[PDB]
Design a protein around this nucleic acid. Structure first.
Ligand SMILES: CC(C)C[C@H](N)C(=O)O
Ligand SMILES: [Hg+2]
Ligand SMILES: [Zn+2]
Ligand SMILES: [Zn+2]
Length: 876
RNA sequence: GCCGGGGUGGCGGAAUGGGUAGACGCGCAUGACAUCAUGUGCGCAAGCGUGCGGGUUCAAGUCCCGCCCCCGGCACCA
């Protein structure tokens, strides 16, 4: 009997599929129903290890499966080559972006191949290639003609390291999404913006009937931050200008004891009295250089400064002082807020800090508010000290005060969103050029459609493209010196480049027509493949990619190019992958595990000594090491940085693909985080082995046996197996359609074990033949090699043309099941009787069990509950 | 503090229209020549066992009431 050998069959079969062209997506899916399985394309930066493969595998399992079922599958793959992620990688290794990009793409593309993964590469797409970004620019123009793209000056986020501006969504915890060790800063500058906010309502209203992870949906709702309320106009004293503010508590208007303007608000300086004019300019610019991190380090000791001007409370008419404090966001509402310390803990704290007035106008139902208040009372209540509103309820009060302000023309009801606009212009070389020219006479002029693409200046000098503070294209007149396509005089091309997230925002749409030189894609085509039925990815693109794509699809929908309005119908979010990591040497002494500083620091814990127990309790262990000392190991995220990756190729060579697949899809539940391990792999070896042995050993017999027969005529073990078979066929089919792989696999390990047992007694019957035909077909998605291999010992064509096994309902039916006999609620034993056996039969069969405990325990019995399914309770 | 999801074996994890808890796998332990085969929730035992405390029921991981700890999210309203 031969043995299972990966190398001998793996690469073999891989070529076979590639050449046979099975996962080649059709152009316009017929009435066969389509399936668009797609995983987020990668950032060509770094080598591919196992942690990275978890997502593509699943997409492969899924794609293969759907393919067998007959659906027209589209399982594209490509590269998110342009932007900061890539360029920053290259620049780190002093390599030229274009070289570094095509280097990874080559490697990465090999790994995937070495894994059994099949794409329809006739659709590969590289974002940084002119053939692609050509269209980023064509889109950008169409957005401009619809006034969705524009320029504007103001403070923006700046990443010193990246040496460019970042969108708000690229500022995770006031730090760069890439350099979580670099505190983002603020700078005055004029950039480009996409009016995503013009889609704030739809972007929210459509999240409703969506089948996505709660976590994601939640986050977007918070990022969009819709907030119903009112815009109130406070007349400034002496001047003509009226200052507007936003609030959700118009019912506390009489509580307004002072206004507050954002340090960057226009009037903050145009109102500050001369004697203060200096103190304001000092603080205004002080709040600027203050990084978000620095702000969030003050707690509630917020700062502020009195301008020197006053305003009139459009409700009472009294003169309230006007201040300015960083806690107010120029980018939110109207950069101005009416302060009501009595009903807002943030304002309250401020008021009490700078000796400002606190005035209650909302009374708590029942137990009166302790005067003087010691804390702002926010909850609803009754309106007091509020002119003609006294005795009204906060709730009804609002719409009233609103309708009121609206009548007097002092304010209006208005909805505002937290969502700020999208800042896409970037000061980096490696990126799409913004198709705009800056004529001196006409101003900002768009490049003609046909004059596209605006090719990127070829710069083969690393030390040149390196960002120093402004677009590298600024020192290249050969590029930025052109003529205005409007008047004709001398103009200047835009030196800034679109951000990476601009191209990743519609690729899924590009794969549907990867070679279109007239349009970014043919509507007819994309309409036949969208939306994306399944979308494997990660949650780190919650407010980013998953946000922007929705915008872009809505925009493209309005141009009438895409019929849907939500790109990703389904969306899975796989979990991290960990791996036992070496943390360093330790000094064991009995039970005391003293830690040398280098190790401790790596563990990142305050303790400098632990007990053999704590080391265990924290999930670590002590191993012997090549340096002849004891090292401490403990899982950790598998990453290059950690140097605990498990390289795809170096692995498949020594082990196998299918082995890595199984070890990955059975480690734990997909969404959970697994821990790649030796034992994990060893187990996959054994599972794959036995699958092989079993079919090998009955190969000859199988060949001379026919797999045809009449099910109803089956009896005994035969009939038994036939059930267990379809029992499995069902669990497996469902588990797949629900992305629950671990169990689909185990469902197979279990039937395998079933097949072995069946041989201990029964020969090699037709049913058994069929049992293998089905086992293989089902195994395909997980171990496509070993399956195709064994499958050919008895069948001609590839598993790809076998179809998915048809489940047989009638077969799932039980007869003579195993009921459990319990005495007085406690399970005393079990018996074997039909699913229909009447109480009399069960009672009987039970009264004489192994230990006849049902008898020794039931020497009285009163009531007897009997669930024909599997229960018989003898209530003593 | 609010919101979503979670606490099950030495380990990852199965099973909730109440109805042999712990499938499948790992690990361990014996029997055979790294691998198969058998066993493996805990306790010597009475007996006990799905985060804690009550309760409903012949029967509770599943249902009711009160509560703790964990993970993730937190814009507005309340
Ligand atoms: C779909 C893309 C936005 C995914 C992103 N390029 C990444 O690989 O992290
Ligand atoms: Hg390129
Ligand atoms: Zn950065
Ligand atoms: Zn001009």
């Amino acid at each position: 009997m031969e043995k299972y050998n990966p190398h001998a069959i793996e690469a073999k079969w891989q070529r076979f599929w590639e050449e046979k062209g099975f996962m080649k997506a059709k152009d316009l899916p017929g009435g066969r129903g389509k399936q668009y399985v797609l995983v987020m394309f990668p950032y060509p930066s770094g080598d591919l290890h196992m942690g990275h493969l978890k997502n593509y595998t699943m997409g492969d399992v899924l794609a293969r499966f759907r393919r067998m079922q007959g659906y027209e599958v589209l399982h594209p793959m490509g590269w998110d080559a342009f932007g900061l992620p890539a360029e920053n990688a290259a620049l780190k290794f002093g390599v030229h972006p274009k070289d570094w990009t095509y280097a990874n793409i080559r490697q990465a593309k090999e790994s995937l191949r070495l894994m059994g993964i099949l794409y329809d590469w006739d659709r590969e797409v590289t974002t940084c290639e002119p053939e692609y970004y050509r269209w980023n620019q064509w889109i950008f123009l169409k957005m401009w003609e619809k006034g969705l793209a524009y320029r504007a000056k103001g403070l923006v986020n700046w990443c010193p390291k990246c040496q460019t501006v970042l969108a708000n969504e690229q500022v995770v915890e006031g730090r760069c999404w890439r350099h979580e060790d670099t505190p983002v800063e603020k700078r005055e500058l004029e950039q480009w913006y996409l009016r995503i906010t013009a889609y704030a309502e739809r972007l929210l209203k459509d999240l409703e009937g969506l089948n996505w992870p709660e976590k994601v949906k939640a986050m977007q709702r918070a990022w969009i931050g819709r907030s119903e309320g009112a815009e109130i106009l406070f007349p400034v004293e002496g001047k003509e200008v009226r200052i507007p503010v936003f609030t959700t508590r118009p019912d506390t208007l009489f509580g307004a004891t002072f206004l507050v303007l954002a340090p960057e608000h226009p009037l903050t300086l145009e109102l500050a009295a001369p004697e203060k004019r200096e103190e304001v300019l000092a603080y205004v610019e002080a709040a600027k250089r203050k990084t978000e991190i620095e702000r969030q380090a003050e707690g509630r000791e917020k700062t502020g400064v009195f301008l020197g001007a006053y305003a009139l409370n459009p409700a009472t008419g009294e003169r309230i002082p006007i201040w300015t404090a960083d806690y107010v966001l120029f980018g939110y509402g109207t950069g101005a807020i009416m302060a009501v310390p009595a009903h807002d803990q943030r304002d309250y704290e401020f008021a009490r800090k700078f000796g400002l007035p606190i005035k209650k106008v909302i009374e708590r139902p029942g137990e009166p508010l302790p005067e003087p208040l010691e804390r702002a009372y926010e909850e609803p209540g009754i309106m007091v000290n509020s002119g003609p509103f006294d005795g009204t309820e906060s709730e009804e009060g609002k719409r009233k005060v609103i309708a009121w302000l609206e009548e007097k023309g002092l304010g209006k009801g208005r909805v505002t969103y937290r969502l700020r606009d999208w800042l896409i212009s970037r000061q980096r070389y490696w990126g799409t050029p913004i198709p705009m020219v800056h004529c001196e006479a006409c101003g900002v002029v768009p490049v003609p459609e046909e004059e596209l693409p605006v090719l990127l200046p070829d710069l083969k000098d690393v030390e040149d493209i390196r960002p120093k503070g402004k677009s590298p294209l600024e020192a290249h007149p050969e590029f930025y010196e052109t003529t205005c396509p409007k008047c004709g005089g001398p103009a200047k091309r835009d030196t800034d480049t679109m951000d990476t997230f601009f191209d990743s925002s519609w690729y899924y749409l590009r794969y549907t027509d990867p070679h279109n030189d007239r349009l970014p894609f043919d509507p007819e085509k994309a309409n036949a493949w969208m939306p994306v039925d399944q979308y494997i990815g990660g949650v780190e693109h919650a407010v980013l990619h998953l946000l922007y794509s929705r915008f872009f699809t809505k925009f493209l929908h309005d141009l009438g190019m895409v019929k849907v309005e939500e790109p990703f119908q389904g969306l899975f979010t796989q979990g991290m992958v960990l791996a036992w990591t070496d943390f360093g040497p330790v000094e064991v002494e009995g039970s005391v595990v003293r830690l040398p500083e280098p190790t401790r620091i790596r563990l990142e814990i305050p303790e400098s000594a632990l007990s053999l127990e704590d080391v265990r309790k924290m999930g670590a262990e002590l191993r012997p090491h090549e340096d002849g000392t004891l090292h401490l190991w403990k899982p950790a995220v598998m990453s290059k940085s950690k140097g605990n990756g498990v390289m795809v190729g170096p692995f498949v060579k020594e082990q196998g693909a299918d082995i890595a697949r199984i070890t990955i899809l059975f480690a734990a539940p997909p969404e959970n985080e697994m821990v790649w391990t030796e034992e994990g792999v060893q187990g996959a070896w054994r599972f794959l082995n036995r699958i092989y042995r079993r079919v090998a050993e009955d190969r000859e017999a199988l060949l001379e046996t026919s797999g045809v027969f009449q099910a109803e005529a089956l009896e005994g073990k035969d009939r038994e197996l036939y059930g267990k078979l379809h029992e499995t066929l069902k669990k497996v089919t469902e588990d797949l359609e629900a992305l629950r792989f671990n169990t689909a696999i185990a469902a197979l390990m279990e039937f395998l074990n079933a097949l072995y047992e069946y041989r201990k007694d029964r020969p090699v019957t037709p049913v058994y033949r069929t049992a293998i035909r089905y086992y293989l077909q089902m195994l395909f998605p997980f171990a496509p090699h070993l399956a195709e291999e064994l499958w050919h010992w008895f069948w001609p064509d590839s598993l790809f043309e076998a179809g998915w096994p048809e489940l047989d309902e009638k077969a799932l039916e039980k007869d003579v099941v195993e009921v459990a006999v319990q005495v007085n609620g406690r399970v005393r034993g079990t018996i074997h009787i039909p699913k229909d056996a009447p109480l009399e039969v069960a009672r009987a069969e039970a009264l004489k069990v192994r230990n006849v405990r049902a008898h020794l325990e039931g020497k009285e019995v009163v009531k007897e509950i009997y669930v024909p399914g599997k229960i018989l309770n003898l209530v003593v």
